[PDB]
Each structure stands twice: as C-alpha cells, then as structure tokens.
C-alpha cells in the first residue's frame, strides 16, 4: 500500500492536494509495515521529500532521521491522524522504526567492521536483545546475510560487524582525522601550511 | 629517444609486414614499451568490469624486438573466459574506431589485445591461448596482455605482462618462472599446463600534463587504506583451496617417483608433469609468498601504530 | 556547533557586563554546544572576573579545563546548573577519561559521573553517539567502553606538553621503521644476487 | 499468415540484431536459421522487413561499410 | 587576453598529469610529418558530483579552419559520441580543450558552438610555449557579462584540486619510476613492500606538518586557537588502536596459521633438494 | 511404499476424467490427492494447479483446503483446531486417518527447524511446551533428528539443554593443512629411503 501511495504522489496528472494526502497516507502505511528493508528506508526517502515538511508527522520523521527518542505526547497525536482501519495493532501496535533501522544498520555495519554481542547491538538499536537476535536470524536465514550465533558467550559472529576490521578501520579513522587536521590548518592559516611544507623539503 | 618514439612511421610497418620475421620464431620479441595512456586506460576499463572479465584492443607498432603500445581503447564484448575468438563481435566497433582515429591523425595499426583476469592473477587461460594462437597467424602483429585490477591495489606494483604464445607442436625451452599471484582450486591445473607456452615481456614508460597527478597527490592522503588490505580474511578461500589441491599433487609425486615412469631405452623430455617435486616446490612458493605477504600487511600496522601507545 | 558560535562571539564582543553575565548561562544551556574555547578568550568576559560575577567565569573554567568530579567538589561556590548543562558536562567527562585510556571500565565511569545505575549511564553514551561528538561502543561483556573517536573542548594549556611529547614519540620511531624496511628489501636482494652467482658459476665447469 | 510471417521475421531480426553489427548476408542466413522450425521465409520478404526495421529505426546501416547493419537502440 | 576577470564561479575543477602527454605525443607526430606544429582541439569527459568537477578523461576532436575561425565537425562528434557512451556511460561530457597562449576571440567563437551540446561547457587552455615552472594549464568557465550595456561572452578562471582513484594511481607509480630490473628478476619482498614503504614515508610527512603547527600556536607566528588544538589533542589520545583481550587472541590466531603455512612450505622446498641430492649420489658413488 | 510423489501425479492425472464422469468419487478422490501432496515434503498443489472450483465451496471439501493451508504455513495451532472442529469429514475415511499421526509429526518437525535458529542453547521443556506434547516424545524426536541431520547439535541430558551447533569457525583451512601435513611425512620417508 505504501509503495502505491508513494508512486501516486510522484505523478503530475494527480491533483496537488491529493498528492499530499497520498504522501501522508504512504508515510502512515510505511510506519505500520513489518519485517524487512522498507520501513526505515522509505522513511529516509520520505525525509528527502521536501513535502513532508507540510505534514504534522514531520516531527516523527525529522526525529527518526536525527535518531532522537520518541515519547508519549507524539504517539497520541499520530494515533489520532490515523484513519480507523489503520489503527491496526498487535495489541499495542504503534510507530516503531525497526525494520529498516535494524536491517539497514546491519548493512551499514558490515561496511564498518567484523563480529558483535547482542547486548551492544540491542543497546545501539534501542530494542531488546531478542528482537535483534530474531531479525538477525531472519536475515541470515533469507541469505541476505550469513553468520552463526554463539549463545554460550552471548555473541553473534557475522560475515562482518565489530572486531578485527574495527582495528583496521580505526587506523583509517585516525589517519583520516590527520588529513582533516591538515585541511583545517590549510583553512585557518595557509601561511604556516606553505612554510612548514618547505620544512619537510629541507629535511 | 623521448620525441622519436612519439612519431609513428607508416613505412617502417610496411617493411616489417612484408619481411614477416615471426614465421621463423615466435619467442622473437623481448621488450615492451607501453604508453602511460595505454596503461591507465587498460586499468580503468578492467576495473569497470568489477570482478567480471572485459576485453579491449591496443593500437601500436613494432620496431625490431621492441613492441610499442601507443594507445588503447575498450570494447563492449563478453567472452573472455568462455568464447574462443570473442573479438569477432568487437570487429565492427574496431573498424569504426580505426577509421575515426585515422582522420584526427592517429594512423598506428592494431598491435594486439588486452583482457583481464580479476582476482586470480596474470596468466593466459585455455580460452585466451586458443584465441591468441589464431591471431598470431591471421591478425599480425598481435600480442596478449593481462592485468589484475584488485591485486595490484594491495601490492602497489602494476602486474602487467604482455605475452606471446608458441604455435601448436612447438617445444618450449627451459623458460619457467614469473610473478606469483595465487590461483583458485580448479584454476591451478590450467596454469600448470599453459605457462611454458608463453613468455612475459619487460615494460618501460614516459609522462607529461592532465591524468597522473590527481592520482599522485591523492595517494598522499589515501595511503592508509592500502595497508588495511588485510588479505587473510578477504581471500581466505584461496588458502584452503590451494593446500587441499597441493596434497593431491604430493600423492601424485609419491606414486611417480615410487613406481617410476615406465621407460625402455627412452628418457623423459619436456612435459608439465616431468620431475614432480621440482614443479611442486614452486607451487608451494606461489601459496607461501601470498600468505606471508598477508602477514607483512599485518606486521606493519602493529609496529607503526600500536607501539606508540599514550606516552 | 558551527553556526551558533559565529553568532555568539559577535554578540559578546558587542556588549559588556550585565549582558555577558547572562550570555554564560545561555551558552551552557544551548544545545549542540560541546565547545567552550572561544568565548572565554574574549576580553569582554574577562572584566566580570575579580568582582561579583567572577564565579561565572570560574565555572566556565571548570567546564573548560575540568570535569564533573572537579565541579561537585566546589558545588557551593559556583552557581547552579540545569539538566541540559549537567548532561553536557557528563558527556564532556567521558571525552576526558577517553584522553587517558582508550577503554574505560564502568566502575570508573560510574563514580565520576555520579550516576544512579548502568542503564541510565548507557543511555547518555547512546545520546552522545547520535549527535556525533563522541563515537564509541559499549562492551557489556568485559564491562568497558571502547571508544572509536572523541573530540576536544579541553583547552588545557598547562597540560599541552603531553600532546607534544606523544606527537614527538610518534615522530622518532617513524625513521626507526623506515631504516627498518630499507634493510629488508636490500637483504632480499642480496640473497637473490648470490644465488644467481653461485649457479652460474657452478654450471660452467661441467663443460670442462 | 502472410502478414504474420512478416512480424515474426521482424521479431527475428530485432532479436538477432540485439544479440551488434552484422553483414547483410549473415543476417539473412541467421533469420532462416532461427525461423527454420516455423517456416522458410522468402528472401524477398526478409529484405522488406529489414527496411521496415530501419524505418522503425530498430537497426541502422553502418555509415561506411558494404552491407552492414548495426543494432541501434 | 579578453576576459571579465570576475569572482571565481560556482564550480571547481580538478587537474592532474598523463592526458597532455597523449596530446604532446600527437603534436610531435603531426609536426614531424606535415612540417609545421599543428594544434588539436578535443573533448573532455569526467564527472561532476555536486557543483564540483573531476575531469577524468579526454579524447581529440576533428577541426577545420575557414577564415580565421575554427569549426569542429558535428557529424564526427555524434558518431564518436554513440561509440564512446556504450563503454563509458558513467562518465559524461564536461566541455573542451584547446592549445595556445593567452585567451583570444577564436576560443570564444568555438565555446558558443559547444554550448549547443550542453548549455554550460568548461573551457581549458594549455600553453606548451610556457617559460614558467608551475603547471601551465588554466581552467575557465564562460560567463555572460554585460559590458557597456551589451552582453558579451567573457571567461572567468577557476582554481583546482587533486582527487580519487587508487586503481589508476598504482599505474602512475610505475609510469613515474621507470626503473629496470637488476641482476635477478626483482625480489618478491621488494615488489610487494614498495607501497608499505611509501606509506610510512607519508605518515612521516603527515606528523611533521601537524606537530610544527601545534608548536607554532604556542610559540608565536601562528596565534593561539581552540578548534584545531582540541582536535590534535584528541588525535593523540586514541592510540594504541585496541588493547582489548578480545582482539589479542584473534590477531595471534591468524599469525599462527601463517606461521604453520610457512613451515610446511620451507620443508617441501628442502625435500626437493634432498630428492635431487639422493638421485645424483646414488648414480656416482653406488650403481643405484 | 514411501513414494508419495508417484501417488500425487496418479491422483492428479485421474481427477480430470473424474470431472467428466462427475460425482460421487470426486469427493473421496480429493482426500487421497491432499493427503498425498502433504507427505512429499513439500511441493503442495491440491488447490495453483486445477482441482475443483465451484465444488470446493461446499463445507465438506472446505476442511481440506483449510487443513492444507495450515500444513503449508506449518502452524500447529490451526491444524489441531480443524481436526477437532470438522472432525467427521477427515476422521471417518480410514486411509487418510492412518497417516494423520505422521502429518502431526511432520508439522512439528518443520516448526522445530525454524525455531532452532535464534538459539544455541534451547531447553527441552521449552520446545515440548511450544510443540504441545510431553518432554519424552520431543527427546525421542531430537535423537532421531540429529542422526538424520535435520537438527544440528547434541544434547545435554544432565541439565536438559540442546547444545546446538553454531560452534563452527573455519575448519576448512585446518583440515587442508592436516592432509598437506600427512603427505609430507610419507614423502620424506619415501625420498630418504631411495638412498642405497
């Protein structure tokens, strides 16, 4: 449903007002979804769409992108924007982020390192360890990831995320901060930059 | 010289093409000089394939035992490690290119082909040698070139060999060894037979003012990422594969030496399974050199960064 | 921040005294501030020192050179903080601990921050990481914080010598590493040279 | 059927030309090779189809080449 | 020249050396054959990502002179545009280059024709008559500027940068060095380690510029600052890059594997000379 | 026999002709067809192929459709609800009735293999409770499953745990070095023994 609404909002033979209601509607179907790539990835797409800033769910949107915790006042309002059939619940159904942010963060994390505990992963995605463990398992099972779990020492080992690459990538980070420092030095005072370069050519 | 090399001479090629010395000897050539252009274009095109094979063409000339590679251009053709004489599909695009090239003022004839073997080394396969052997009859002059665009980033050394192969039923000499970049488990066999059929040629260069430098300066920042190659995990699959195959060869060696080659007033002559340990020792070296090369990427980090601590 | 700093200096330079006193209380409250260099160095703030608003610079000092344990210690002499000001100092204690040890255990963090539990403590480091002023990850297995990255605020101009010493140790060993590799490459080369020599030498005599 | 053969012939030409440049004789033979199972097309028919294809701009002739066509998208 | 001489525009261009070696080579060929030096005008391709431009590659175009004006042939370009786009479609058309000394009207005439392909093309000009040691390529964009109330196409100059492509760089190393093999074949250790060597040498040079800056801000000659010192302070503190109990064993586990691997190879090598020694000995001292 | 697949195709092939003649046999044949399709494990099609389009609406055949949907999703709670609710239409026919115990085991066995994956320590009373049977039949299922290797791991019966296996690392490097290491011993013995 979310895809369909989103596509309508991108058409130019769709009336103006209705493009935005449709975007509003897309956001709401995207927020209710479960398991997989789409809920945080559509939130990011939606955030880049400048039209969401005319919406009242803009708050939830900006707060999710900037990774700011959600509170009671905002759930009450969102629940009220919902059409009656869309008040669809698991007996507590709400706005809960999770399916791209777990999945997207696991994909960003494979590019960041080697292997990790559940405690750290649960604490980082702000969910219980079991939910992470459940979605990680699903992702390994669907072959969109691979790994094995050590539940004796409470650690999942992944085809990349949090270990020997962390060491390698920290060397890269440190050396990039060195480059950054060289850029900042060139910006404030180019005089010392030229002068101190000639000091290397003397040695 | 430096400028004499840059000009092309149509007449020098006309004499050479009439004379046709290569019919006498196909091991004739010995040096290469490849343009800075030829090389950069060849690496970038190879890299655009990914880890998937691509072919391009080279324009050049020959002068004595030197081959000269003036320019190169890419082809959008698929058939490097499957289709025998993949180049044919490319012919229409080549005919266009040479015609377009002549009119701006580049008149130099096609010297040969380039392809690439990504993540398995610089060597010619069964498809490649078979396509070259037709080209040395028909296409002349025609030379094979191989480059790897992933291996190269780690080592910092350009692996580029321009080769030529010998025609069928030609006895190789004692010219064995070359650069050691590991092969996968089933590709090991294929190298083993083909290597003596060809030779690599040594390479020179020259330089001036738009492409080189964005790269040279960028390396001044960039240098950190090449030391975090960390091969041992990236191509973990290579070690297990070669070592299980090396074991099968030692079983072959135990029998070969053990029973002996059956011979009655005949003594072994050149073969790719003649003196099994002598072959085998070298296969151990291509797997060992890569492994320790992996250790050396690790050793550098450990000494340079980690020993500093906080004083 | 970025933008907000460029506004505040101009405003400080613009006014005097009674407004400057006010501005200190606002800078510390204002979000995205996890720097407190630039305003201190201006002449304008400096006048309030040695008077009845001296305590405001003395606190600003305490944030700049010091931390949460240095604060509590003279809690009486300095005027109050609000929740945003305290939470900013508490994140700013983690950067300091990170200056000494790369990995800092919970019992150290816990004492210094004077926090009620582990979960309240672990919430503060996740909030920092989203704003990206500190980068780092929690290890609940060994009970450490392992920091990826951290940034100063830390003027600390007496202690600066340490930073020069470490930069200097980083220097001297470099050359010790280069003479290093230069040696090995020549030793590889020396071996191949002799090996080529001996074989060619031996082969000739077979002919006789 | 006659009209139908033209379309199939055309489909064959585009299909073959997609799989880039071919000489006229080669193209025709392939059309026959492909179409053999269904029926043997008349040579005259093929040529007409090729021209139609060019107008449709499915395939173009090489600028300087004796009977050569390139697949143009 | 003929130039507006305005403020630097909204795009940046980055500059770097082999392609002009391609141009020079042609120029030498052409000069020898005709009997006079002949310029070439050509296209640029590269990329743009944002407002910043990386000029990655180039190719020569065909041209003719009728009057004192240059006309680039369109039919030629459109044929070469369809072949090149098949292989490189990631890259796109930036503009052109020409040859000569300071800016002149005959460049502005040709730049209007290029405006037909893309509405905003870049202009680039190389003097191979340069008496100067700095890089003698200068980059321009065209601005439409009003002078004496009449709108005139006038050029504005851009500054440059250096950028990516490690895959390409390793070839620029080989190209640059032009070194020959010694007595052997060149060693495996030698060939492997060069990047590693040069990498250390970059860190020597990186430490040096930061260090002399920090001292300068204390000493005088650079003033005191907070933004740069807080960051340098922080840069020191991160070292050493892990010390955890978790890292140590996994680091050694890989070191230990490559320690056995090496041992099993040095024995295989020794076995070979043993089989060779035993073969030659039995023939000579015994009867085998 | 065990050749569930040969049954499916013969009943499927038969149904078309049974449509032409018609009733009553179409109703009974349809039970034989659904039964057979389940046992193959799995490639289910008693309903994306062709067999009964207006007749399926009658509640008699209806049970079967629902029962098959519960088998394909492999959900225990629905299967057992149908067996109880529409008791007569499945239970009265003796052929189908015979396999039913096996079908129950089949669902529980697939459900177990899905479940197992988030853990590396899972308790036997926890899985018995989840499957809806006592500890002893689950214990007996596990033993047979490890030997068939449709569950990976071993049991700790002095603490009631499954030490599932995810204790893998590499191994592939370490075994190839062992094969390499054994040939070098035989090779040294061989070469040195050639001397005199």
Author numbering:
A (entry chain D): 204 to 406
B (entry chain E): 24 to 334
C (entry chain G): 8 to 215
D (entry chain O): 672 to 690, 692 to 745
E (entry chain F): 29 to 316
F (entry chain B): 248 to 443
Question: What wording appears in the published article?
Answer:
When associated with the von Hippel–Lindau (VHL) tumour suppressor substrate receptor, the CRL2 complex is the primary regulator of the Hypoxia Inducible Factor 1-α (HIF-1α) transcription factor.
To study the molecular interactions between neddylated CRL2 (CRL2~N8) and the CSN, we performed single-particle cryo-EM to resolve a structure of the assembled CSN–CRL2~N8 (referred to as the holocomplex). Using 3D classification, we were able to generate maps of three different structures: (a) a holocomplex map at 8.2 Å, (b) a map of the complex with little or no density for VHL at 8.0 Å, and (c) a map of the complex with little or no density for CSN5/CSN6/VHL at 6.5 Å. In the model of the holocomplex (8.2 Å), the main interactions occur between the C-terminal end of CUL2 and the extended N-terminal helical repeats of CSN2 and CSN4. To generate a model of the CSN–CRL2~N8, we performed cross-link guided modelling which allows the placement of the WHB, NEDD8 and VHL subunits using identified cross-links from XL-MS (“Methods” section). A further two cross-links between CUL2 and NEDD8 (CUL2K382-N8K33 and CUL2K433-N8K6) allowed the positioning of NEDD8 near CSN5 (green text). For the isopeptide bond of NEDD8 to reach the CSN5 active site, the WHB domain must be extended from its crystallographic conformation towards the CSN5 by 19 Å.
